[PDB]
Amino acid sequence: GFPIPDPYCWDISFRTFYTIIDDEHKTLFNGILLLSQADNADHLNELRRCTGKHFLNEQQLMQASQYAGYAEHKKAHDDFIHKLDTWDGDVTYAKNWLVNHIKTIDFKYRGKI
Amino acid sequence: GFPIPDPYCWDISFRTFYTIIDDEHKTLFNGILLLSQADNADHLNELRRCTGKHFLNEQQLMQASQYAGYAEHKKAHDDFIHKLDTWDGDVTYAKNWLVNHIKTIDFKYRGKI
Amino acid sequence: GFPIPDPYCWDISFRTFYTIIDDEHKTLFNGILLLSQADNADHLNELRRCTGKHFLNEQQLMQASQYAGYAEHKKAHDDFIHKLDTWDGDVTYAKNWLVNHIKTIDFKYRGKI
Amino acid sequence: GFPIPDPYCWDISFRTFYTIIDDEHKTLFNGILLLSQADNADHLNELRRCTGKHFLNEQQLMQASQYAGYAEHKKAHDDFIHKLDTWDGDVTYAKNWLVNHIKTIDFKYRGKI
Amino acid sequence: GFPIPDPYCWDISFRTFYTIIDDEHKTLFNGILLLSQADNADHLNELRRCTGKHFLNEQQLMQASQYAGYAEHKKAHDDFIHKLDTWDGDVTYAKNWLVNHIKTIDFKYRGKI
Amino acid sequence: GFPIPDPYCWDISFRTFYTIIDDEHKTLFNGILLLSQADNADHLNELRRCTGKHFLNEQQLMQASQYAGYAEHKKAHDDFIHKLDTWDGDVTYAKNWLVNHIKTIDFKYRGKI
Amino acid sequence: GFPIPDPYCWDISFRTFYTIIDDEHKTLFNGILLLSQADNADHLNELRRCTGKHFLNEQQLMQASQYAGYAEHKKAHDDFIHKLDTWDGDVTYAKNWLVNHIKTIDFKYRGKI
Amino acid sequence: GFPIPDPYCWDISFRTFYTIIDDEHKTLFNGILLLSQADNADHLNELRRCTGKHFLNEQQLMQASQYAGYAEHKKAHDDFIHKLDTWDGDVTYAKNWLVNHIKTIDFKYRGKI
């Protein structure tokens, strides 16, 4: 269980050392930051697009080295897409989910992919 | 329900703001324009090739961001391919179908993919 | 002197047998037709984008086979870009230029690239 | 003079309609925000990497359509790289430079590339 | 039913006007020519590699435009791979098969893909 | 049954003549060499990543020419991934497995892919 | 002096072990054989296209490994293009040139690129 | 002065965190080790190919982020190519050069590209 950055933007404690991944992660932080400012459809579309794209890329990256934790990782992703597709306005959930997903599930592939 | 451009060529009211998509759309308008001029096999092959190619590209683009309206969108496409594969010479249908497909189904993905 | 299509849209007489090239050529007919409908900045941008992109792609295709007419062909393209970049509203010139360029200059690379 | 966002993160007013460009722009806001939090080498590296990569990608996109404002735009980029490479710690300058570059220089390529 | 070229090498009557396809076809002719000269494993490996590669590429090309005759076309290919995988030394069959496959099944996709 | 190089690094007797493949093979030798030096998680992650990546690439290469020995080859690979995913510390096994896999199963595709 | 194959088609003695290169080389044998059958524009175009494309691809492969013989090799290619571009109908020269180029100049890059 | 590994193979102390780079670096250790085993043409070719390819790839990665140390880094690479191209059999030099290049010159781009 990790601290929630304030303002809610990416910081170097989240570095995975995969620059493409890190750059995509910065977009997820920004997407949740927007929602935290105005819970509207522009902001949600933005986060939803970035999230869908990042999850698929990250999944491809795992697949390229036949990563052993793929299936659990993909199910985490798919649950979160699902939350976004049924958005409830729970920004707090979303803030926590991302911090924890990166620092525990994404950090796990470092050095294996 | 939208107006049918006369001559039947693309105009900027159809812009999706995805330049690759817009350029492919211009080919669909042209394909239907040809058929409207001479209902023959050259013209139908031309429209059929362009349509098949555009639908698959557009489908790929939706998939890259895990677009939530993919499945309904893909079924729309597949119905229209089917009409082309069983061409009846109904140019009027084709003119309407495209205008409506772009302005209602394609416009829906804007900002999400 | 080739006939100028009316409406000013691509027809199969302009076929080069290179499908990607033909699809790009459709976009150039469309950009000139829009300007013939309303000579404004939007229509010019559209044509100008499609023309710059088409000229570079066709140039790349020529280079891939070390086409002997490359230099002369690139010069013809560059002269038209210059005309678009100093646009005076002479649609007639443009309509003629495109028909002639495709049917006498582009047609010369067929079978060689 | 555009307003400087606070927190200094991307918002949808900076949208260019080019999704890859917008995602890169989010990374530049983030790099400046980190420097505003702690002016150190890690934060500078991050911003410097993201800026060099973004400038080259955007340059490539301009070149793909033979964009007429390329040279002037490349010069603006190159001047900012120089500032990052001779970094004096003036975050204020950077915050202003980015907002202005996007809303007056990048916005000018919209519809042309 | 078409003439069998003598020597068994590609000629321009087999042009599909897809240069990548034509170039791959030249390799198939050569592969059968080798077998006609020495029925050994080097020659068969050569033809088998070229054939496998060409069929898959050609299949991809058909798929990119959602070609309506794909399934019949793919089954033709797969039967011929099968013959090669159970090679009997029937060079005559192979000579006929290729000429007929190109001039009747491959010629069918021209203008549709 | 082949000799085990000492030190356990690649030598030119393992050349497949596919430079990409050979370069990937050098990484597998190195991965097993590391394990032979310190059986830890860094070393195993390194070998596991390289192995997963190589097997998938090599599998793609086989698929591109519709290689007839694919299925047996893929099952060999998948068994070895499985050993790595249930690592027992048997370095001896791993040393033998690789030498034999290359010199008998990989050497088999030479000239067919 | 290497033997000139009759019929003038590629055989496995010309193998370079680079499958893409070998497939391109087959096309150059074929282009010369056609000219030996009928010295016309179609046959020349075919050979000229295949030669320009092959020379650029092989050049790119050399550059990818910073091959030390690049400059001298590029010059040999360029001299042959010049001969095709000033074609005098000397098929004999061409038949000899290709056999020699592959077996003494191309063979020298084997293992180095 | 860094320790020279014995056996002269890559270890995780050389890790750059760029997986493609690390895999290429493994090939350079291997090429020097072979020369240390037998100073012949095969071993030199191997090392020379892997080095030319690695230097160009790493250069491309530097350029993708407009890395500020590019020019100086390219010069260091070019000097080593020159040494390989004028190979005098000084393996000791090579062993030292590689260890030093990676741990002091390559390590400097980490986080910047």
Coordinates of C-alpha atoms in Angstrom, one line a residue, chain C residues 1-105:
Chain C
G1 CA -4.7 17.0 -73.9
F2 CA -6.8 14.7 -71.8
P3 CA -10.5 15.3 -71.1
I4 CA -11.1 16.9 -67.7
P5 CA -13.6 14.7 -65.8
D6 CA -16.9 16.2 -64.7
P7 CA -17.6 15.8 -61.9
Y8 CA -14.0 16.2 -61.2
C9 CA -13.4 12.9 -59.5
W10 CA -11.1 10.0 -60.2
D11 CA -12.2 7.4 -62.8
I12 CA -10.6 4.1 -63.8
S13 CA -8.9 5.6 -66.8
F14 CA -6.4 7.0 -64.3
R15 CA -5.5 3.6 -63.0
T16 CA -1.8 3.0 -62.5
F17 CA -2.2 -0.6 -61.2
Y18 CA -0.5 0.4 -58.0
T19 CA -3.4 0.3 -55.6
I20 CA -1.9 2.5 -52.9
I21 CA -1.0 5.1 -55.6
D22 CA -4.5 4.9 -57.1
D23 CA -6.1 5.5 -53.6
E24 CA -3.8 8.5 -53.0
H25 CA -4.7 9.9 -56.5
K26 CA -8.4 9.8 -55.5
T27 CA -7.6 12.1 -52.7
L28 CA -6.0 14.7 -55.0
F29 CA -9.1 14.7 -57.3
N30 CA -11.2 15.3 -54.2
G31 CA -9.1 18.2 -52.9
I32 CA -9.3 20.0 -56.3
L33 CA -13.1 19.4 -56.5
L34 CA -13.5 21.0 -53.0
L35 CA -11.6 24.0 -54.0
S36 CA -13.8 24.3 -57.1
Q37 CA -16.8 24.3 -54.7
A38 CA -15.3 26.8 -52.2
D39 CA -11.8 28.3 -52.5
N40 CA -11.1 28.5 -48.7
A41 CA -8.3 27.6 -46.3
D42 CA -9.9 24.3 -45.1
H43 CA -10.1 23.0 -48.7
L44 CA -6.6 24.2 -49.5
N45 CA -5.1 22.6 -46.4
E46 CA -6.8 19.3 -47.3
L47 CA -5.5 19.3 -50.8
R48 CA -2.0 20.5 -49.7
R49 CA -1.7 17.8 -47.0
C50 CA -2.8 15.0 -49.5
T51 CA -0.5 16.3 -52.2
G52 CA 2.6 16.6 -50.0
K53 CA 2.0 13.1 -48.6
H54 CA 1.2 11.6 -52.1
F55 CA 4.3 13.2 -53.7
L56 CA 6.6 11.9 -50.9
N57 CA 5.1 8.3 -51.0
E58 CA 5.3 8.2 -54.8
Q59 CA 8.9 9.4 -54.6
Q60 CA 9.7 6.7 -52.0
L61 CA 8.2 4.0 -54.3
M62 CA 10.4 5.4 -57.2
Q63 CA 13.5 5.3 -55.0
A64 CA 12.9 1.7 -53.9
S65 CA 13.6 0.5 -57.4
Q66 CA 16.2 3.3 -58.2
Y67 CA 13.8 4.5 -60.9
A68 CA 15.8 6.3 -63.6
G69 CA 13.2 9.1 -64.0
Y70 CA 13.2 10.1 -60.3
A71 CA 14.8 13.4 -60.5
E72 CA 12.7 14.8 -63.3
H73 CA 9.6 13.4 -61.6
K74 CA 10.5 14.9 -58.2
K75 CA 11.0 18.3 -59.9
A76 CA 7.4 18.2 -61.4
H77 CA 6.0 17.5 -57.9
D78 CA 8.0 20.2 -56.3
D79 CA 6.8 22.7 -58.9
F80 CA 3.2 21.9 -58.1
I81 CA 3.8 22.1 -54.3
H82 CA 5.2 25.6 -55.0
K83 CA 1.9 26.5 -56.8
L84 CA -0.1 25.3 -53.9
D85 CA 2.1 27.2 -51.5
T86 CA 1.5 30.4 -53.5
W87 CA -2.1 29.6 -54.2
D88 CA -3.8 32.2 -56.4
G89 CA -7.1 30.5 -56.8
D90 CA -6.6 29.1 -60.3
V91 CA -8.6 25.9 -60.0
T92 CA -8.6 25.5 -63.8
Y93 CA -4.8 25.2 -63.8
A94 CA -5.0 22.7 -61.0
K95 CA -7.6 20.5 -62.7
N96 CA -5.6 20.4 -65.8
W97 CA -2.2 19.9 -64.0
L98 CA -3.4 16.8 -62.1
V99 CA -5.0 15.0 -65.2
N100 CA -1.9 15.6 -67.2
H101 CA 0.6 14.7 -64.5
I102 CA -1.0 11.3 -63.9
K103 CA -1.7 10.4 -67.5
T104 CA 1.8 11.4 -68.8
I105 CA 4.3 11.5 -65.9

